[PDB]
Amino acid sequence: MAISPRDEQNRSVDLWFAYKVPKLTKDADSDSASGYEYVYYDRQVGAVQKSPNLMNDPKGALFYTLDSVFGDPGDTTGWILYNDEMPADANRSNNATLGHTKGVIAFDIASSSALWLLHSWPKYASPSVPGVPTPLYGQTFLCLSLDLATAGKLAAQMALHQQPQVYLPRTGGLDHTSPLYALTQPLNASAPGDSDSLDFKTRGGVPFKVIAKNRKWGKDFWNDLVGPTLKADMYVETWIRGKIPPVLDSDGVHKTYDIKFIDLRKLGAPWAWPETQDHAKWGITTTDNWVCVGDINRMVTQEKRGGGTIAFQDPKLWKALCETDLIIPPPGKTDAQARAMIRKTHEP
Amino acid sequence: MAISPRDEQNRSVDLWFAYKVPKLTKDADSDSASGYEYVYYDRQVGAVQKSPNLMNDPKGALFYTLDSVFGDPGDTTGWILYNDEMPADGHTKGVIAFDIASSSALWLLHSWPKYASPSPLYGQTFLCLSLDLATAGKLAAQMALHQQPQVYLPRTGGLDHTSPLYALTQPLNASAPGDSDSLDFKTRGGVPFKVIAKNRKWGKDFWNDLVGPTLKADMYVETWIRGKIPPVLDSDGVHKTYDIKFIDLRKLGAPWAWPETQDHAKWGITTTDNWVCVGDINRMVTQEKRGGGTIAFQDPKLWKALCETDLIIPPPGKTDAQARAMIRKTHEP
Ligand SMILES: [Cu+2]
Ligand SMILES: [Cu+2]
Ligand SMILES: [Cu+2]
């Protein structure tokens, strides 16, 4: 069958999204959340809802998607794996100058089909080691159905800008002139400028943009590249973009107060957690329903490394993500004072 | 004048210790602590007390000590600035300063003079010891072999190239047999201390597998944060950072207590025999492969003050025992 994202029932789907929760504790003897629970979204369900599965189960959209690639590949099935922190079974040291971008491009040459999985797990994925990695952080996933020509145009962009660190690839007999093949070879090309944006569509016709920075980029990825590219403002007002010092409590002791929380309780996932326990590599705009899922988090301080984000319009998913904000002030402070503390992390 | 630590009143002193507080917010208008306030200790005062100074003022033991070395050095005065950054292919700083004509020296842990890194966030310890030139040389020989620090802005002061202090300014190529080393020294005032070092081969627990056994006393680690506590449930599914372990100076006249995660935590004490340790290595289980070490000395007064800085605050609905179990869970690999 044609390479495709698989949904929660192991059926082909054009696009899916997941938001995985972090590991969340009651005490030393039990957890509220293991860190493998998640909410799931695609356009056939049409709503963001808590999944009955855990991401490390041998079921659910993540497992079914990757098992349909790694499980029993045909002779023309192949994949490009990349991560700035390679998994142990690559048995290679990391090149810190390469892109800080993570994902899987899988393809089948005979059927001219492909898929792209974006994730933010270090040391993932492996084509032969089972399971999933660290459960400690909130994380987002996006999985897109592509044709082979689109996968190749994406691979051509990555060779120049994102510059992913590729490991354990399978070529599936690719012709060596393929841009997908070139992504398995050393990346040396010089890039024009410090950023690049390209328009693509899924096989099902869903438009998306891949907005990429290269190692020469030094400005604000979100406000100076993504916003301008989308012709919209990023909704950054309540972003944690730096460290907040401890604050005084009424007992005379200073404590960590998170202030900004991410809250999935309206979506059926009965948890809320500090934004500092979240990879926070997603963002939305204030208008036009853009949802961005990618490699780059919200911190002002960034390494000069390649990477990017995927942007697409989706009113349902936009509204669900918009309403996950939760602001809790430190003791004695107002909502207004709490929001000012968050904004203070946006300055140098 | 011979090289010597200087106390809060710019008098020569054999040894002094300081604990600087992190920057701590009161509200949008003011900080409870700027991050330069500190408590100070030496054996002349005989108690750990809040200083009236800010550490970055041109007053107080740290400034007076540094100014006595770098402000107007004599022709045979020299120094080695070092840190534990990895060699060439956010780090612990120190200074060894010396004067050949007077055969005098001092060792300052966790600070450099301002000009070596010009312009508060975290709690930090400081220690300064009076040494003779021979002892400073034996310390430098150990560092060339084991800790292998990176060296910055040295001044040789005419040292002979055969001196181990001079050797510390030259490329460090040694590769010792064994993974660690310990040496005994004394200050000019006669206070014994040990320097306990690991080199880059060391892969075990620095504190429990090297320092403790070397001292023949267990490190007091039971309430150490040695890793990350996940967010903990408050109510209705909202999980928050509960620090659980705090460092509390309020019994010492310094009105601040803060999370141990806002502290460099490059110090420890033993459960018996009053050992105080200040060094390069923090309390985290996860450690990079690199040389480094700690000073250890006995001090009943300083030990008790540091012991009593423990503050445990359980998350809501939890007992003290449950809180301590959550702290101990961070000790797992
Ligand atoms: Cu990196
Ligand atoms: Cu070729
Ligand atoms: Cu000679």
XYZ file of C-alpha atoms and ligand atoms in Angstrom:
684
model
C 0.000 0.000 0.000
C 1.004 3.641 -0.472
C 3.040 5.205 2.334
C 0.666 7.321 4.403
C 0.111 8.623 7.917
C -2.075 6.155 9.807
C -4.771 7.305 12.226
C -5.758 5.902 15.628
C -7.528 2.943 13.937
C -4.630 2.120 11.549
C -6.421 3.699 8.571
C -4.692 5.959 6.068
C -5.170 9.659 6.823
C -3.876 12.789 5.095
C -2.663 14.592 8.239
C -2.651 14.101 11.983
C -1.541 16.037 15.052
C -0.814 14.924 18.601
C -0.043 16.794 21.826
C 1.721 14.528 24.335
C 1.585 15.421 28.035
C 4.654 15.420 30.321
C 5.233 13.026 33.177
C 3.287 14.480 36.114
C 3.660 13.329 39.720
C 1.397 12.849 42.712
C 4.199 11.799 45.087
C 7.197 9.456 45.039
C 4.793 6.479 44.797
C 2.456 7.412 41.912
C 2.060 9.637 38.844
C -0.987 11.534 37.600
C 0.370 11.107 34.042
C 3.048 8.754 32.753
C 4.056 11.185 30.016
C 2.783 8.985 27.207
C -0.837 10.189 27.270
C -1.853 12.507 24.456
C -4.632 14.349 22.703
C -5.115 13.538 19.036
C -6.487 15.499 16.099
C -7.216 14.919 12.453
C -9.793 16.350 10.086
C -11.860 13.159 9.974
C -12.454 13.160 13.729
C -12.789 16.944 13.483
C -12.046 17.582 17.159
C -9.068 17.521 19.509
C -9.710 14.811 22.097
C -7.772 12.688 24.551
C -6.590 9.417 23.040
C -7.420 6.095 24.716
C -3.865 4.997 23.831
C -0.419 5.720 25.224
C 2.203 6.693 22.675
C 4.411 3.754 23.708
C 1.575 1.280 23.078
C 1.716 -1.008 20.034
C -1.328 0.926 18.811
C -2.353 4.495 18.101
C -1.439 6.851 15.288
C 2.270 7.059 16.135
C 2.818 3.301 16.305
C 0.628 2.509 13.299
C 2.317 5.177 11.178
C 5.866 4.081 11.960
C 5.057 0.368 11.938
C 3.639 0.790 8.429
C 7.121 2.027 7.430
C 9.635 0.018 9.487
C 7.608 -3.172 9.993
C 7.794 -4.925 6.616
C 9.234 -2.555 4.008
C 9.075 -3.408 0.342
C 12.182 -3.380 -1.824
C 11.470 0.225 -2.894
C 10.503 1.456 0.598
C 13.022 3.740 2.254
C 13.396 6.375 4.912
C 15.442 9.378 5.980
C 15.850 9.679 9.760
C 17.337 12.804 11.304
C 17.979 14.202 14.788
C 20.544 16.491 16.372
C 20.852 13.771 19.061
C 21.137 10.463 17.265
C 19.831 7.279 18.922
C 22.352 4.913 20.477
C 21.969 2.334 17.711
C 23.391 4.820 15.198
C 26.712 4.372 17.085
C 27.978 7.797 15.979
C 28.931 11.017 17.746
C 26.721 14.052 17.140
C 27.830 16.932 14.904
C 26.784 19.962 16.940
C 26.956 22.268 13.916
C 24.126 20.522 12.067
C 20.463 21.443 12.236
C 18.540 21.080 15.469
C 15.663 19.403 13.723
C 14.122 15.962 14.188
C 11.892 13.824 12.032
C 11.232 10.994 9.615
C 10.741 11.178 5.848
C 9.502 7.820 4.572
C 8.832 6.934 0.960
C 7.977 4.193 -1.505
C 9.397 4.686 -4.993
C 7.126 2.186 -6.736
C 3.958 3.943 -5.510
C 5.377 7.516 -5.622
C 4.136 8.036 -2.059
C 5.721 9.510 1.056
C 5.029 10.720 4.570
C 6.716 13.222 6.877
C 6.661 12.900 10.664
C 7.822 15.876 12.704
C 8.571 15.325 16.384
C 10.831 16.764 19.070
C 12.110 13.606 20.801
C 15.913 13.337 21.079
C 17.398 9.953 20.156
C 14.376 9.027 18.005
C 13.335 7.306 15.908
C 15.067 4.004 15.339
C 14.076 1.524 12.608
C 14.879 -1.482 14.851
C 14.739 -0.471 18.551
C 11.130 -0.556 19.819
C 9.322 1.820 22.131
C 9.634 5.567 22.586
C 12.019 7.868 24.513
C 11.882 10.318 27.413
C 8.372 10.991 28.815
C 9.329 14.128 30.743
C 8.094 16.944 28.476
C 4.968 18.147 26.765
C 5.539 17.696 23.018
C 3.748 18.110 19.687
C 3.716 15.857 16.619
C 2.613 16.486 13.053
C 2.372 13.867 10.321
C 1.700 14.711 6.671
C 0.898 12.658 3.564
C 3.105 13.701 0.624
C 3.718 12.604 -2.905
C 7.275 11.685 -3.848
C 7.870 14.894 -5.804
C 6.910 16.976 -2.759
C 9.119 14.910 -0.448
C 11.987 15.600 -2.848
C 11.363 19.358 -2.902
C 11.310 19.297 0.900
C 14.556 17.292 0.919
C 16.143 19.830 -1.444
C 15.253 22.640 0.960
C 16.597 20.682 3.936
C 19.951 20.108 2.210
C 20.401 23.894 2.037
C 18.775 25.370 5.149
C 17.630 23.069 7.979
C 20.681 20.861 7.302
C 19.459 17.837 9.292
C 21.807 15.277 10.802
C 20.797 12.107 8.945
C 21.369 8.597 10.309
C 20.499 4.958 9.501
C 18.856 5.833 6.157
C 17.358 3.260 3.812
C 17.473 4.277 0.173
C 15.016 1.735 -1.229
C 17.065 1.679 -4.415
C 16.771 5.442 -4.935
C 18.476 6.822 -7.994
C 21.497 8.791 -6.816
C 20.285 11.974 -8.530
C 17.236 12.068 -6.238
C 17.156 14.933 -3.709
C 16.091 12.266 -1.212
C 19.290 10.349 -1.945
C 21.368 13.526 -1.609
C 19.967 13.968 1.899
C 21.732 10.685 2.823
C 25.096 12.103 1.695
C 27.244 14.731 3.437
C 25.653 18.189 3.346
C 28.064 20.833 2.068
C 25.952 23.235 -0.010
C 26.053 26.920 0.865
C 22.712 28.473 1.431
C 21.384 31.721 -0.050
C 20.459 34.145 2.721
C 19.580 33.231 6.285
C 16.081 31.771 5.858
C 13.706 30.229 3.341
C 9.963 29.572 3.082
C 8.249 27.166 0.680
C 4.608 26.360 -0.107
C 3.582 22.706 -0.311
C 0.376 20.671 -0.249
C -0.459 17.288 1.210
C -1.669 14.551 -1.127
C -5.170 15.477 0.059
C -4.649 19.077 -1.015
C -4.019 20.700 2.369
C -1.696 23.706 1.901
C 1.203 24.147 4.264
C 4.411 26.155 4.496
C 7.820 25.005 5.670
C 9.498 28.089 7.129
C 13.204 27.419 7.671
C 16.144 29.275 9.168
C 19.747 28.300 8.531
C 22.787 28.649 10.802
C 23.235 32.284 9.725
C 19.898 33.390 11.228
C 20.203 35.495 14.364
C 16.904 37.363 14.784
C 13.585 36.310 16.386
C 12.449 33.224 14.439
C 8.818 33.815 15.391
C 8.339 37.589 15.210
C 10.914 38.341 12.491
C 10.427 35.348 10.159
C 7.250 33.324 10.805
C 4.855 36.216 11.451
C 6.026 38.208 8.426
C 5.911 35.083 6.240
C 2.308 34.326 7.255
C 1.250 38.000 7.102
C -0.060 37.562 10.641
C 1.139 38.253 14.170
C 2.280 35.377 16.332
C 0.248 35.125 19.538
C 3.201 35.583 21.908
C 1.627 37.651 24.727
C 1.685 34.794 27.282
C 4.767 32.938 25.992
C 7.532 32.060 28.415
C 10.590 33.283 26.511
C 13.150 33.303 29.359
C 13.716 32.512 33.023
C 11.567 33.869 35.881
C 13.395 34.258 39.242
C 11.899 32.799 42.434
C 9.198 34.935 44.037
C 8.405 35.647 47.663
C 5.753 33.580 49.457
C 3.909 34.703 52.588
C 6.007 32.429 54.834
C 9.113 34.485 53.983
C 10.602 31.887 51.588
C 11.132 32.386 47.850
C 9.758 29.708 45.531
C 9.411 28.793 41.886
C 6.106 30.069 40.541
C 5.504 28.883 36.996
C 2.849 31.560 36.235
C 2.163 30.296 32.692
C 0.618 26.839 32.376
C -0.589 24.759 29.447
C -4.044 23.354 30.152
C -5.662 20.534 28.157
C -8.627 20.005 30.500
C -11.188 21.437 28.063
C -10.059 18.802 25.537
C -10.725 15.780 27.775
C -7.108 15.456 28.967
C -7.420 16.234 32.690
C -3.982 17.801 33.167
C -2.337 21.214 33.220
C 1.382 21.778 33.668
C 4.037 24.526 33.620
C 5.066 25.804 30.221
C 8.635 25.222 31.433
C 7.847 21.474 31.373
C 6.851 21.736 27.702
C 9.076 21.680 24.624
C 6.850 24.576 23.432
C 7.799 24.191 19.764
C 4.308 25.116 18.573
C 2.638 28.485 18.204
C -0.460 30.097 16.744
C -1.259 33.464 15.201
C -3.681 36.086 16.494
C -5.674 36.018 13.220
C -6.239 33.705 10.236
C -6.091 30.452 12.247
C -2.437 29.527 11.611
C -0.991 26.598 13.561
C 2.798 26.138 13.600
C 4.493 22.904 14.694
C 8.250 22.629 14.399
C 11.814 22.474 15.685
C 12.151 25.902 17.301
C 10.935 26.767 20.796
C 9.889 30.119 22.276
C 13.062 31.130 24.124
C 14.737 34.421 23.224
C 18.124 32.697 23.515
C 18.706 30.393 20.536
C 21.657 28.535 19.085
C 22.700 29.446 15.538
C 21.586 26.146 14.016
C 19.314 25.205 11.136
C 15.695 24.312 11.732
C 12.178 25.352 10.952
C 8.457 25.039 11.494
C 5.438 23.751 9.572
C 2.559 26.231 9.267
C -0.990 25.482 8.179
C -4.452 26.926 8.723
C -6.969 24.998 10.816
C -9.734 26.839 12.720
C -10.652 23.837 14.900
C -7.097 23.102 16.021
C -6.338 26.823 16.361
C -9.192 27.408 18.798
C -8.316 24.295 20.817
C -4.700 25.459 21.189
C -5.709 29.060 21.885
C -7.814 28.015 24.863
C -5.005 26.015 26.547
C -3.601 29.145 28.232
C -3.712 29.083 32.031
C -2.288 31.958 34.107
C -1.830 31.535 37.858
C -0.217 34.458 39.706
C 2.282 33.967 42.540
C 0.839 34.524 46.036
C -0.642 37.950 46.613
C -0.369 39.010 42.958
C -3.104 39.817 40.434
C -3.727 38.370 36.983
C -2.386 41.670 35.605
C 0.811 41.352 37.643
C 1.216 37.719 36.548
C 0.892 38.665 32.881
C 3.475 41.429 33.340
C 5.901 38.873 34.810
C 5.461 36.699 31.710
C 6.056 39.670 29.398
C 9.243 40.464 31.297
C 10.723 37.232 29.919
C 10.432 38.741 26.420
C 13.085 41.392 27.091
C 16.882 40.727 27.034
C 53.065 43.049 51.913
C 52.751 39.258 51.706
C 49.870 37.827 49.698
C 47.003 37.003 52.058
C 43.209 36.708 52.133
C 41.644 39.910 53.431
C 38.619 39.983 55.716
C 35.579 42.289 55.732
C 37.677 45.156 57.195
C 40.657 44.690 54.849
C 42.765 42.930 57.489
C 44.855 39.891 56.626
C 43.119 36.654 57.576
C 44.075 32.984 57.292
C 40.818 31.750 55.727
C 37.346 33.077 54.928
C 34.076 31.758 53.523
C 31.065 33.472 52.007
C 27.644 32.367 50.804
C 26.049 34.707 48.247
C 22.265 34.655 47.732
C 20.475 34.407 44.354
C 18.500 37.259 42.881
C 15.063 36.962 44.489
C 11.925 38.842 43.440
C 9.586 40.612 45.835
C 7.301 42.206 43.230
C 7.471 44.252 40.034
C 8.965 47.217 41.949
C 11.665 45.560 44.052
C 13.815 42.507 44.683
C 14.036 40.869 48.087
C 17.661 40.172 47.121
C 19.673 41.628 44.244
C 21.878 38.532 44.201
C 24.988 40.191 45.655
C 24.023 39.986 49.343
C 25.921 37.439 51.396
C 26.802 35.880 54.714
C 30.433 35.866 55.771
C 32.545 33.629 58.011
C 36.065 33.504 59.337
C 37.516 32.068 62.507
C 38.289 35.488 64.000
C 34.598 36.435 64.004
C 33.635 32.869 64.903
C 30.085 32.967 63.529
C 28.424 33.093 60.109
C 26.743 36.488 59.785
C 25.063 38.680 57.207
C 27.490 41.123 55.618
C 26.543 44.810 55.294
C 28.213 44.796 51.846
C 27.260 43.703 48.367
C 29.849 41.294 46.972
C 30.393 43.505 43.925
C 30.956 46.660 46.015
C 34.530 47.916 46.371
C 34.294 46.772 50.011
C 34.169 43.429 51.785
C 36.367 40.354 51.898
C 36.095 39.463 48.213
C 36.961 42.935 46.904
C 39.655 43.522 49.513
C 41.233 40.133 48.758
C 41.180 40.671 44.994
C 42.369 44.275 45.203
C 45.296 43.217 47.420
C 46.495 40.958 44.584
C 45.556 42.732 41.342
C 45.338 46.404 42.312
C 49.063 47.198 42.632
C 51.153 44.034 42.205
C 54.844 43.938 43.009
C 57.498 42.837 40.532
C 57.495 39.207 41.761
C 53.729 38.956 42.280
C 51.925 36.680 39.867
C 48.717 34.761 39.486
C 46.876 32.021 37.629
C 43.201 32.443 36.751
C 41.648 29.059 36.014
C 38.315 27.410 35.337
C 37.030 23.926 34.517
C 35.936 24.515 30.937
C 36.873 21.629 28.705
C 40.117 21.979 26.699
C 40.133 23.111 23.085
C 39.548 20.458 20.425
C 28.960 28.882 33.340
C 31.995 27.122 34.787
C 33.804 26.992 38.116
C 36.412 29.749 38.496
C 39.431 30.043 40.762
C 42.576 32.098 41.354
C 45.995 31.080 42.653
C 48.048 34.188 43.470
C 51.618 34.334 44.700
C 54.562 36.566 45.495
C 58.050 35.141 45.122
C 59.984 37.696 47.184
C 57.801 36.963 50.246
C 57.208 33.244 49.472
C 53.476 33.891 49.992
C 50.311 32.868 48.155
C 46.545 32.578 48.361
C 43.879 30.417 46.751
C 40.443 31.845 45.944
C 37.618 29.499 44.909
C 34.645 30.510 42.719
C 35.694 34.028 41.772
C 37.847 35.999 39.316
C 38.725 39.695 39.409
C 36.195 41.776 37.518
C 38.476 42.646 34.606
C 38.787 38.989 33.563
C 35.052 38.827 32.749
C 33.378 42.258 32.885
C 29.616 42.796 32.991
C 23.689 37.504 40.456
C 21.292 34.793 39.426
C 22.281 31.872 41.658
C 23.339 31.068 45.185
C 27.092 30.573 45.379
C 29.853 29.761 47.862
C 33.294 31.332 48.093
C 36.395 30.191 49.944
C 39.816 31.798 50.301
C 42.923 30.321 51.966
C 46.357 31.680 52.912
C 49.187 29.483 51.590
C 52.920 29.582 51.423
C 54.651 29.455 48.059
C 55.706 25.814 48.521
C 52.093 24.750 49.148
C 50.758 26.757 46.206
C 53.339 24.943 44.088
C 52.268 21.503 45.298
C 48.652 22.430 44.558
C 49.609 23.568 41.049
C 51.436 20.283 40.446
C 48.299 18.334 41.359
C 46.178 20.492 39.040
C 48.574 19.920 36.129
C 48.130 16.164 36.607
C 44.468 15.640 37.569
C 42.032 18.593 37.565
C 43.719 19.994 34.422
C 41.917 23.361 34.419
C 41.923 25.865 31.609
C 44.130 28.848 32.444
C 43.471 32.498 31.617
C 45.342 35.809 31.853
C 48.301 34.443 33.844
C 51.055 36.612 35.270
C 54.202 34.626 35.938
C 55.944 37.212 38.138
C 59.338 35.990 36.980
C 58.754 32.388 38.100
C 61.388 30.000 36.894
C 60.197 27.690 34.146
C 60.920 24.788 36.520
C 58.254 25.938 38.998
C 55.000 23.931 39.014
C 53.174 27.255 39.130
C 54.856 28.149 35.842
C 54.055 24.689 34.463
C 50.377 25.320 35.176
C 50.518 28.150 32.603
C 51.839 25.878 29.871
C 49.945 23.222 27.876
C 48.760 20.373 30.097
C 49.489 17.091 28.335
C 49.780 14.750 31.321
C 47.557 11.678 31.595
C 47.877 10.269 35.084
C 47.617 6.613 36.031
C 44.520 6.255 38.158
C 41.291 8.232 38.058
C 41.624 10.420 41.172
C 44.011 11.851 43.749
C 43.957 13.356 47.223
C 46.546 15.521 48.971
C 46.891 17.062 52.430
C 47.954 20.692 52.910
C 47.916 23.379 55.602
C 47.220 27.101 55.520
C 49.909 29.496 56.741
C 47.918 29.680 59.992
C 48.139 25.917 60.383
C 44.635 24.822 59.335
C 44.721 21.410 57.599
C 42.802 20.857 54.402
C 42.569 18.267 51.649
C 42.274 18.748 47.911
C 40.397 15.777 46.472
C 40.577 15.518 42.687
C 39.145 13.440 39.890
C 40.569 13.425 36.397
C 38.697 12.998 33.126
C 38.660 9.187 33.373
C 36.528 9.238 36.536
C 33.003 7.971 35.933
C 31.561 7.114 39.358
C 29.891 9.319 42.026
C 32.434 12.023 42.907
C 30.888 12.663 46.331
C 29.915 9.176 47.524
C 32.667 7.178 45.783
C 35.648 9.542 46.168
C 35.132 12.381 48.666
C 33.326 10.446 51.393
C 35.702 7.476 51.357
C 38.714 9.813 51.307
C 37.472 11.663 54.388
C 36.366 8.440 56.131
C 33.012 10.168 56.712
C 29.772 9.900 54.748
C 28.688 12.893 52.716
C 25.410 14.359 54.007
C 23.435 13.772 50.790
C 20.029 12.635 51.992
C 18.320 15.970 51.190
C 20.397 16.827 48.103
C 18.680 17.618 44.831
C 20.644 15.368 42.464
C 18.182 15.523 39.554
C 14.854 16.961 38.459
C 11.588 16.605 40.375
C 8.640 16.474 37.941
C 5.745 18.896 38.456
C 3.520 17.817 41.350
C -0.271 17.890 41.599
C -1.815 20.794 43.486
C -5.534 20.215 42.843
C -8.010 19.666 40.007
C -5.304 18.370 37.686
C -3.040 21.458 37.839
C 0.566 20.393 38.366
C 3.174 22.911 39.492
C 6.832 23.223 40.392
C 7.206 22.299 44.055
C 10.867 22.822 44.926
C 10.656 20.756 48.163
C 14.329 21.342 49.072
C 15.286 24.887 50.064
C 18.450 26.544 51.329
C 17.639 28.855 54.237
C 19.956 31.511 55.736
C 17.414 33.021 58.153
C 19.038 31.628 61.308
C 22.220 33.502 60.312
C 20.623 36.982 60.252
C 20.129 36.893 56.464
C 16.414 37.005 55.684
C 16.341 34.762 52.597
C 15.551 31.157 51.692
C 15.423 29.855 48.137
C 15.089 26.640 46.086
C 18.216 24.505 45.888
C 17.652 24.492 42.115
C 18.528 28.220 42.190
C 21.922 27.451 43.708
C 25.216 26.354 42.149
C 25.386 23.804 45.014
C 29.136 23.184 44.620
C 29.523 22.472 48.330
C 28.658 19.692 50.751
C 29.225 18.636 54.353
C 29.722 15.233 55.996
C 27.364 13.560 58.467
C 30.144 13.251 61.074
C 33.509 14.907 61.823
C 32.495 18.417 60.677
C 33.949 18.393 57.134
C 33.053 21.306 54.841
C 33.677 20.886 51.089
C 33.768 23.642 48.429
C 34.766 22.703 44.894
C 34.202 22.268 41.149
C 31.555 19.529 41.238
C 27.872 20.059 41.943
C 25.372 17.552 43.351
C 23.782 16.240 40.137
C 24.047 12.519 39.405
C 24.626 13.301 35.722
C 28.169 14.587 35.250
C 30.361 15.333 32.254
C 33.722 13.561 31.938
C 36.224 16.192 33.052
C 38.830 16.910 35.676
C 37.865 18.734 38.835
C 38.153 18.687 42.551
C 37.042 19.951 45.929
C 38.665 21.415 49.013
C 37.700 19.765 52.296
C 38.463 21.088 55.769
C 37.039 20.597 59.252
C 35.189 23.439 60.960
C 32.638 22.716 63.731
C 31.131 26.219 63.565
C 30.793 26.477 59.789
C 29.553 22.878 59.587
C 26.698 23.561 62.005
C 25.668 26.756 60.213
C 25.569 24.958 56.855
C 23.814 21.917 58.314
C 21.011 24.143 59.606
C 20.363 25.772 56.225
C 18.210 22.757 55.274
C 14.549 23.660 54.707
C 12.054 21.004 53.542
C 8.577 22.111 52.434
C 6.266 19.294 51.318
C 3.879 19.712 48.395
C 0.236 20.185 49.466
C -1.166 17.245 51.413
C 2.230 15.544 51.823
C 4.147 14.722 54.990
C 7.775 15.560 55.680
C 8.611 11.894 55.074
C 6.854 11.928 51.691
C 8.714 15.119 50.751
C 12.058 13.528 51.670
C 11.216 10.457 49.576
C 10.577 12.748 46.594
C 13.979 14.369 47.155
C 15.660 10.961 47.404
C 14.066 9.905 44.115
C 16.262 12.484 42.360
C 19.260 10.386 43.435
C 18.293 7.620 40.985
C 20.473 7.556 37.774
Cu 22.793 20.612 20.031
Cu 26.527 8.568 -6.039
Cu 66.328 28.327 32.974
